[PDB]
Design an enzyme around this catalytic site. Structure first.
Site, PDB file in Angstrom:
ATOM      1  N   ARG A   1       1.067  -1.130  -0.188  1.00  0.00           N
ATOM      2  CA  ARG A   1      -0.069  -0.339   0.290  1.00  0.00           C
ATOM      3  C   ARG A   1       0.854   1.297  -0.119  1.00  0.00           C
ATOM      4  O   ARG A   1       1.580   1.494   0.670  1.00  0.00           O
ATOM      5  CB  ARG A   1      -1.107  -0.616   1.423  1.00  0.00           C
ATOM      6  CG  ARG A   1      -0.068  -0.389   2.621  1.00  0.00           C
ATOM      7  CD  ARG A   1      -1.730  -0.856   3.557  1.00  0.00           C
ATOM      8  NE  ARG A   1      -2.747   0.664   3.234  1.00  0.00           N
ATOM      9  CZ  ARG A   1      -3.572   1.191   3.933  1.00  0.00           C
ATOM     10  NH1 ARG A   1      -3.663  -0.003   5.761  1.00  0.00           N
ATOM     11  NH2 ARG A   1      -3.498   2.066   3.929  1.00  0.00           N
TER      12      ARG A   1
ATOM     13  N   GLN B   1      -7.260   4.211  -5.759  1.00  0.00           N
ATOM     14  CA  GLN B   1      -8.384   5.516  -5.307  1.00  0.00           C
ATOM     15  C   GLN B   1      -8.274   6.572  -5.223  1.00  0.00           C
ATOM     16  O   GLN B   1      -6.435   7.377  -5.681  1.00  0.00           O
ATOM     17  CB  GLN B   1      -8.439   5.636  -3.757  1.00  0.00           C
ATOM     18  CG  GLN B   1      -9.406   3.809  -3.280  1.00  0.00           C
ATOM     19  CD  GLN B   1      -9.999   4.006  -1.641  1.00  0.00           C
ATOM     20  OE1 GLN B   1     -11.058   4.120  -1.000  1.00  0.00           O
ATOM     21  NE2 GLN B   1      -8.613   3.998  -1.586  1.00  0.00           N
TER      22      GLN B   1
HETATM   23  C1  LIG Z   1       3.063   6.013  11.470  1.00  0.00           C
HETATM   24  C2  LIG Z   1       1.494   5.320  11.623  1.00  0.00           C
HETATM   25  C3  LIG Z   1       0.819   5.687   9.804  1.00  0.00           C
HETATM   26  C4  LIG Z   1       0.215   4.607   9.887  1.00  0.00           C
HETATM   27  N1  LIG Z   1       0.057   5.171   8.726  1.00  0.00           N
HETATM   28  C5  LIG Z   1      -2.072   4.349   8.040  1.00  0.00           C
HETATM   29  C6  LIG Z   1      -1.807   4.349   6.799  1.00  0.00           C
HETATM   30  O1  LIG Z   1      -1.383   4.382   5.573  1.00  0.00           O
HETATM   31  N2  LIG Z   1      -3.122   3.699   7.038  1.00  0.00           N
HETATM   32  C7  LIG Z   1      -3.829   3.517   7.741  1.00  0.00           C
HETATM   33  O2  LIG Z   1      -5.121   2.370   7.619  1.00  0.00           O
HETATM   34  N3  LIG Z   1      -3.635   3.082   9.221  1.00  0.00           N
HETATM   35  C8  LIG Z   1      -1.911   3.416   9.100  1.00  0.00           C
HETATM   36  N4  LIG Z   1      -1.695   3.608  10.420  1.00  0.00           N
HETATM   37  C9  LIG Z   1      -2.716   2.977  11.684  1.00  0.00           C
HETATM   38  C10 LIG Z   1      -3.578   4.300  11.833  1.00  0.00           C
HETATM   39  O3  LIG Z   1      -3.348   4.943  12.092  1.00  0.00           O
HETATM   40  C11 LIG Z   1      -4.645   3.022  13.121  1.00  0.00           C
HETATM   41  O4  LIG Z   1      -5.076   1.402  12.365  1.00  0.00           O
HETATM   42  C12 LIG Z   1      -5.609   3.857  13.026  1.00  0.00           C
HETATM   43  O5  LIG Z   1      -6.254   4.470  12.433  1.00  0.00           O
HETATM   44  C13 LIG Z   1      -5.737   4.838  14.737  1.00  0.00           C
HETATM   45  O6  LIG Z   1      -5.294   3.575  15.819  1.00  0.00           O
HETATM   46  P1  LIG Z   1      -4.459   4.531  17.114  1.00  0.00           P
HETATM   47  O7  LIG Z   1      -4.595   6.148  16.818  1.00  0.00           O
HETATM   48  O8  LIG Z   1      -5.584   3.393  18.119  1.00  0.00           O
HETATM   49  O9  LIG Z   1      -3.558   4.023  17.133  1.00  0.00           O
HETATM   50  P2  LIG Z   1      -2.119   4.592  16.355  1.00  0.00           P
HETATM   51  O10 LIG Z   1      -2.536   5.190  15.355  1.00  0.00           O
HETATM   52  O11 LIG Z   1      -1.099   3.033  15.865  1.00  0.00           O
HETATM   53  O12 LIG Z   1      -1.256   5.703  16.508  1.00  0.00           O
HETATM   54  C14 LIG Z   1      -0.805   5.266  17.893  1.00  0.00           C
HETATM   55  C15 LIG Z   1       0.699   6.406  18.216  1.00  0.00           C
HETATM   56  O13 LIG Z   1       0.691   6.004  20.425  1.00  0.00           O
HETATM   57  C16 LIG Z   1       2.479   6.226  19.570  1.00  0.00           C
HETATM   58  N5  LIG Z   1       2.660   5.775  20.622  1.00  0.00           N
HETATM   59  C17 LIG Z   1       2.342   4.098  21.202  1.00  0.00           C
HETATM   60  N6  LIG Z   1       3.408   3.871  22.894  1.00  0.00           N
HETATM   61  C18 LIG Z   1       3.076   5.610  23.138  1.00  0.00           C
HETATM   62  C19 LIG Z   1       4.354   5.426  24.456  1.00  0.00           C
HETATM   63  N7  LIG Z   1       4.675   5.028  25.376  1.00  0.00           N
HETATM   64  N8  LIG Z   1       3.963   7.197  25.130  1.00  0.00           N
HETATM   65  C20 LIG Z   1       3.696   7.461  23.679  1.00  0.00           C
HETATM   66  N9  LIG Z   1       3.178   7.512  22.170  1.00  0.00           N
HETATM   67  C21 LIG Z   1       3.356   6.152  22.314  1.00  0.00           C
HETATM   68  C22 LIG Z   1       2.773   5.940  18.962  1.00  0.00           C
HETATM   69  O14 LIG Z   1       4.148   6.485  18.949  1.00  0.00           O
HETATM   70  C23 LIG Z   1       1.826   6.700  17.927  1.00  0.00           C
HETATM   71  O15 LIG Z   1       1.968   7.804  17.689  1.00  0.00           O
HETATM   72  C24 LIG Z   1      -0.664   4.402  10.527  1.00  0.00           C
HETATM   73  C25 LIG Z   1       0.098   4.145  12.568  1.00  0.00           C
HETATM   74  C26 LIG Z   1       0.930   4.674  12.467  1.00  0.00           C
HETATM   75  C27 LIG Z   1       1.984   4.548  13.662  1.00  0.00           C
HETATM   76  C1  LIG Z   2      -7.122  -4.487  -1.207  1.00  0.00           C
HETATM   77  C2  LIG Z   2      -8.068  -4.151  -1.721  1.00  0.00           C
HETATM   78  C3  LIG Z   2      -9.138  -4.433  -1.828  1.00  0.00           C
HETATM   79  C4  LIG Z   2     -10.634  -4.458  -2.076  1.00  0.00           C
HETATM   80  N1  LIG Z   2     -10.120  -2.381  -0.864  1.00  0.00           N
HETATM   81  C5  LIG Z   2     -11.233  -2.338  -0.150  1.00  0.00           C
HETATM   82  C6  LIG Z   2     -10.465  -1.977   1.020  1.00  0.00           C
HETATM   83  C7  LIG Z   2     -11.938  -0.993   2.067  1.00  0.00           C
HETATM   84  C8  LIG Z   2     -11.681   0.109   1.734  1.00  0.00           C
HETATM   85  C9  LIG Z   2     -11.141   0.993   0.911  1.00  0.00           C
HETATM   86  N2  LIG Z   2     -11.521   1.993   1.239  1.00  0.00           N
HETATM   87  C10 LIG Z   2     -12.659   2.544   1.723  1.00  0.00           C
HETATM   88  C11 LIG Z   2     -13.454   3.445   1.628  1.00  0.00           C
HETATM   89  C12 LIG Z   2     -14.154   3.420   1.908  1.00  0.00           C
HETATM   90  C13 LIG Z   2     -15.294   1.855   2.233  1.00  0.00           C
HETATM   91  C14 LIG Z   2     -14.238   1.141   2.411  1.00  0.00           C
HETATM   92  C15 LIG Z   2     -13.287   0.910   2.081  1.00  0.00           C
HETATM   93  O1  LIG Z   2     -16.058   4.539   1.762  1.00  0.00           O
HETATM   94  C16 LIG Z   2     -15.363   5.927   2.031  1.00  0.00           C
HETATM   95  C17 LIG Z   2     -16.860   6.162   1.836  1.00  0.00           C
HETATM   96  C18 LIG Z   2     -15.214   5.969   3.524  1.00  0.00           C
HETATM   97  C19 LIG Z   2     -14.586   6.219   0.668  1.00  0.00           C
HETATM   98  C20 LIG Z   2     -13.155   5.917   0.636  1.00  0.00           C
HETATM   99  O2  LIG Z   2     -13.041   4.379   1.415  1.00  0.00           O
HETATM  100  C21 LIG Z   2      -9.455   0.533   1.128  1.00  0.00           C
HETATM  101  C22 LIG Z   2      -8.263   1.084   1.449  1.00  0.00           C
HETATM  102  C23 LIG Z   2      -9.382   0.974  -0.590  1.00  0.00           C
HETATM  103  C24 LIG Z   2      -9.982  -0.931   1.379  1.00  0.00           C
HETATM  104  C25 LIG Z   2      -8.751  -2.021   0.309  1.00  0.00           C
HETATM  105  C26 LIG Z   2      -9.066  -3.177  -0.439  1.00  0.00           C
HETATM  106  C27 LIG Z   2      -9.601  -3.657   0.935  1.00  0.00           C
HETATM  107  O3  LIG Z   2      -8.944  -5.167   1.322  1.00  0.00           O
HETATM  108  N3  LIG Z   2     -10.261  -3.581   1.624  1.00  0.00           N
END
Ligand SMILES: Cc1cc2nc3c(=O)[nH]c(=O)nc-3n(C[C@H](O)[C@H](O)[C@H](O)COP(=O)(O)OP(=O)(O)OC[C@H]3O[C@@H](n4cnc5c(N)ncnc54)[C@H](O)[C@@H]3O)c2cc1C
Ligand SMILES: C[C@H]1CCN2C[C@]34Cc5c([nH]c6c7c(ccc56)OC(C)(C)C=CO7)C(C)(C)[C@@H]3C[C@]12C(=O)N4
Length: 438
Positions: free
Chosen positions: A186, A226
């Site tokens: 991704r 997308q």
């Molecule tokens: C660098 C990064 C990039 C990401 N990119 C994507 C992406 O492109 N697409 C996607 O779908 N999801 C991504 N994610 C994950 C996404 O943010 C999560 O799955 C979810 O949307 C939000 O979860 P969260 O906020 O609970 O945890 P997270 O978003 O993972 O954030 C947790 C934070 O807590 C911090 N932390 C951890 N332990 C400590 C501590 N002891 N003290 C202080 N801070 C601490 C970490 O540094 C991090 O900033 C990413 C996460 C990270 C960390």
């Molecule tokens: C590996 C490809 C195969 C099929 N894909 C779909 C997805 C789910 C999903 C995505 N974005 C979404 C999304 C949605 C709802 C669902 C999704 O709705 C709004 C309205 C918020 C608009 C844009 O964003 C992707 C990041 C593209 C992932 C990636 C992926 C997959 O498994 N699950």
């Protein structure tokens, strides 16, 4: 007022900071890393999250996110020949604003707003050793030089993500997530080189008026593609088999040629690669997909610490509902706090947990069922992962209105020691997945 300590400023931590601050509490948030750094790709936020954001700053954050509002009218799903096999309508999914934007752009907007309303933020601070008595809670703030400082508050929100050492330190998991054998390439596409490559020009068709949303089902490859913000940003996702012991982190670069080999043998491979190949090699991410099991509890024994977001219920980043459920966690917790008061903090944490647990767990186990599967190339209507679980009971749900309506019933179940049966998810779904209340 209530003194809230937030550990981790990802998406869920920032939302909880804003939600607690806007509902009148004092908030000190800690983060160990530079979070204003462009890393990762795109996050989607569905209607159940955006109606929460809509309240922040009397609309001010929504207005700042307006360029990121999803304008796609359908999901165009293809087979490996390029034939359009299914369209999935989004007119009801997108009746209310949905967002899709880079994670770094959403972190920046939320972070700017949290400072503006006076959230106290400390960057470059790792937090460890939670503790709690019946009059409050405390954490130790570490600086990189070895210094330790006790910080005190009324309770701790652990939003430190999927590698929560807060979770390890308190209510740890008995066994690690086991590897599913699938991983996810991704990335954001580089737009300045995507433009001017004429063989890629086709992806710009209509993106000014309707953001692209294409999905491709190949053997051993589920691919999505997308656009958002009138084609200023393109992202892509490819789920594929992988047996290597990868680390579920967001900084390990991967070889683009693995992705080329996956697709080039198919008639659709050339078109798709003409876009994908414009990914900066630094930004090519191979992210392992682990199945996490629900926790036994989110709230600690003494009631002054709660796990939310990815600490609580990590979902596949291919859920679609990952960040949205985390934003719901924050709003329900902050709404429970305000109905409970400072003299009933432990009550408020136990209420938020009963409200959130079955719903969050259902999304967790559903979104893995839809991600799990062994489909062959004839892919049919309901279908092995298509992003069709856009259920109205998920995206149409108002968690704050539900919390205000149910708060006294949950309190009754807490105080009388009985089980609360949430209705913020279908009744059948609980029994079909074997959800046991917390
Ligand atoms: C660098 C990064 C990039 C990401 N990119 C994507 C992406 O492109 N697409 C996607 O779908 N999801 C991504 N994610 C994950 C996404 O943010 C999560 O799955 C979810 O949307 C939000 O979860 P969260 O906020 O609970 O945890 P997270 O978003 O993972 O954030 C947790 C934070 O807590 C911090 N932390 C951890 N332990 C400590 C501590 N002891 N003290 C202080 N801070 C601490 C970490 O540094 C991090 O900033 C990413 C996460 C990270 C960390
Ligand atoms: C590996 C490809 C195969 C099929 N894909 C779909 C997805 C789910 C999903 C995505 N974005 C979404 C999304 C949605 C709802 C669902 C999704 O709705 C709004 C309205 C918020 C608009 C844009 O964003 C992707 C990041 C593209 C992932 C990636 C992926 C997959 O498994 N699950």
């Amino acid at each position: 007022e209530v003194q809230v300590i937030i550990v981790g400023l990802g998406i869920v931590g920032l939302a909880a900071a804003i939600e607690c601050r806007e509902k009148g509490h004092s908030v000190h948030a800690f983060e160990k890393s530079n979070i204003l750094k462009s890393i990762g790709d795109c996050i989607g936020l569905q209607s159940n999250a955006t109606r929460i954001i809509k309240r922040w700053g009397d609309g001010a954050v929504h207005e700042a996110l307006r360029p990121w509002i999803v304008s796609s009218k359908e999901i165009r799903i293809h087979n490996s020949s390029g034939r359009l096999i299914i369209r999935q309508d989004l007119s009801e999914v997108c009746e209310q604003p949905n967002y899709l934007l880079p994670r770094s752009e959403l972190i920046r907007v939320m972070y700017e707003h949290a400072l503006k309303i006076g959230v106290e933020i400390s960057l470059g601070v790792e937090v460890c050793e939670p503790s709690e008595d019946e009059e409050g809670a405390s954490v130790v703030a570490l600086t990189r030089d070895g210094e330790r400082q006790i910080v005190r508050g009324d309770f701790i929100i652990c939003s430190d993500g999927v590698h929560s050492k807060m979770r390890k330190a308190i209510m740890p998991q008995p066994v690690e997530p086991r590897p599913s054998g699938y991983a996810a390439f991704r990335a954001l596409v580089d737009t300045e080189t995507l433009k001017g490559d004429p063989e890629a020009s086709w992806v710009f068709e209509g993106v000014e008026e309707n953001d692209r949303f294409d999905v491709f089902f190949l053997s051993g490859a589920q691919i999505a593609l997308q656009s958002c913000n009138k084609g200023k940003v393109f992202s892509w996702f490819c789920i594929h088999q992988d047996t290597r012991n990868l680390l579920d982190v967001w900084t390990s670069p991967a070889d683009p040629n693995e992705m080329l080999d996956l697709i080039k043998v198919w008639p659709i491979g050339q078109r798709l690669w003409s876009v994908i190949r414009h990914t900066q090699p630094q930004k090519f991410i191979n992210y392992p997909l682990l199945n996490h099991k629900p926790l036994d509890h989110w709230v600690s024994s003494h009631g002054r610490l709660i796990l939310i977001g990815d600490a609580a219920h990590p979902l596949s980043p291919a859920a679609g509902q990952g960040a949205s459920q985390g934003i719901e966690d924050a709003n329900v917790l902050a709404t429970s706090l305000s109905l409970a008061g400072r003299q009933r903090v432990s009550l408020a944490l136990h209420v938020a947990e009963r409200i959130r647990y079955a719903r969050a767990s259902a999304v967790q186990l559903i979104s893995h069922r839809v991600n799990e599967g062994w489909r062959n190339q004839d892919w049919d209507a309901y279908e092995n992962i298509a992003s069709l679980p856009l259920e109205t009971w998920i995206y149409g749900h108002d968690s704050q209105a539900y919390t205000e309506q149910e708060f006294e019933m949950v309190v009754r179940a807490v105080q009388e020691g009985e089980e609360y049966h949430a209705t913020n998810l279908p009744d059948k779904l609980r029994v079909q997945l074997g959800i046991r209340n917390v």
